[PDB]
């Protein structure tokens, strides 16, 4: 694998979005990963509808603004035979009746891959696939108020994750002793972290569980 990867540079990643007060992180993580895979397939970067996922993926196990799983989202897209664009089905930050319209479907998937639960495996996937959906322990105030640099939280759990985000690359700071990171796109808007991104500690015993529940859709 390369020493550093950043899929934003290659056109795989849409601008940072903002889930608001709805517990829809899982939907943003899932659209992120699917946006990347669709871009690889077609060469077209098209923002996808989180609202479509929030409103419609109940049968697959998702619970709207009260939480969900990226894999349940990928299963929905496969079951449903499509997913609408952001433009056609805009984000409301509240759970509403399903308004899926197949005329405006711009993405599909044929299942998903769960990555082995090691950072080495995660690195190989990011290098070869594109952006990857991941679960992290975001349940510390240090994360909420993160601004810049490599995020390390001594109390982070590698087993107990509560927030779905998107790994878009990895790399290292040229500064000192702990300098590797995962480049992670959050869904809390551009004013959180580094333009909506966080550089998370990499190769430090699966910090915050970043490799514990990593997956992406097949297209």
Strands 163-172 and 180-185: antiparallel
Residue from 163, 206, 207, 208 carrying the catalytic annotation: 163
Whether 22 sits among the annotated catalytic residues: the reply is: no
User: Are the C-beta atoms of residues 165 and 134 closer than 8 Å to each other?
Assistant: yes
Residue from 186, 206, 207, 208 carrying the catalytic annotation: 186
Angle between helix axes 70-80 and 25-42 (nearest 10 degrees) is 50
Contacts of 121 (CB under 8 A, 6+ apart): 115, 211, 214
Whether 25 sits among the annotated catalytic residues: the reply is: yes
Q: How far apart are CA 130 and CA 197, in angstroms?
A: 16
Give the nearest distance from C-beta 43 to ligand 5T9 in angstroms. 29
Would the annotation count 55 as a binding residue?
no
Query: Which residue in 13, 30, 70, 123 binds ligand 5T9 (CB under 6 A)?
Result: 70
Nearer to ligand 5T9, 106 or 201 (CB): 201
Total residues contacting ligand 5T9 by CB under 6 A comes to 17
Residue from 22, 25, 56, 65 carrying the catalytic annotation: 25
Give the nearest distance from C-beta 41 to ligand 5T9 in angstroms. 23
Interaction of residue 190 with ligand 5T9, rule CB under 6 A: no
Interaction of residue 26 with ligand 5T9, rule CB under 6 A: yes
User: Are the C-beta atoms of residues 216 and 130 closer than 8 Å to each other?
Assistant: yes
Nearer to ligand 5T9, 20 or 171 (CB): 20
Of 166, 159, 162, the residue nearest 182 (C-alpha): 166
Of 132, 58, 134, the residue nearest 96 (C-alpha): 58
Whether 207 sits among the annotated catalytic residues: the reply is: no
Interaction of residue 68 with ligand 5T9, rule CB under 6 A: yes
61: phi then psi, degrees, rounded to nearest 5: 115, -5
Query: In Å, how far from its chain's centre is CA 167?
Result: 6
Which residues in 142-167 are b (16+ Cβ under 10 Å) and which e?
Answer: ebeebeeebbebeebbbeebebbbbb
Site string for ligand 5T9, 116-155 (x = CB under 6 A): -------------------x--------------------
Q: How far apart are CA 108 and CA 190, in angstroms?
A: 28
Query: Which residue in 8, 20, 47, 67 binds ligand 5T9 (CB under 6 A)?
Result: 67
Q: Name the site residues for ligand 5T9 (rule: CB under 6 A).
A: 23-26, 61-63, 67-70, 135, 161-164, 213
Active site residues: 25, 163, 186
For the annotated binding site for Zn(2+), the residues are 9, 50, 71, 86, 92, 96, 114, 137, 140, 160, 162
């Amino acid at each position: 694998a390369p020493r550093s990867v950043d899929w934003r540079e290659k056109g795989y990643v849409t601008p940072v979005k903002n889930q608001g007060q709805c517990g829809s992180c899982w939907a943003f993580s899932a659209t992120g990963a699917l946006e990347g895979q669709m871009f690889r397939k077609t060469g077209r970067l098209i923002s996808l509808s989180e609202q479509n996922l929030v409103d419609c993926s109940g049968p697959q196990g998702n619970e709207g603004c009260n939480g969900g799983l990226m894999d349940y989202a990928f299963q929905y897209v496969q079951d449903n035979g499509g997913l609408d664009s952001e433009e056609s089905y805009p984000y409301e930050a509240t759970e509403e009746s399903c308004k899926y319209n197949p005329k405006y479907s711009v993405a599909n998937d044929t299942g998903f891959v769960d990555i082995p639960k090691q950072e080495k495996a995660l690195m190989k996937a990011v290098a070869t696939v594109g952006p990857i959906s991941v679960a992290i322990d975001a349940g510390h105030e240090s994360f909420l108020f993160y601004k810049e640099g490599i995020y390390f939280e001594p109390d982070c759990s590698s087993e107990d994750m509560d927030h779905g985000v998107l790994v878009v690359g990895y790399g290292f700071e040229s500064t000192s002793d702990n300098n590797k990171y995962w480049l992670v796109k959050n869904s809390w808007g551009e004013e959180w972290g580094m333009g909506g991104y966080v550089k998370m500690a990499k190769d430090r015993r699966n910090h915050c569980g970043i490799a514990s529940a990593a997956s992406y859709p097949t297209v």
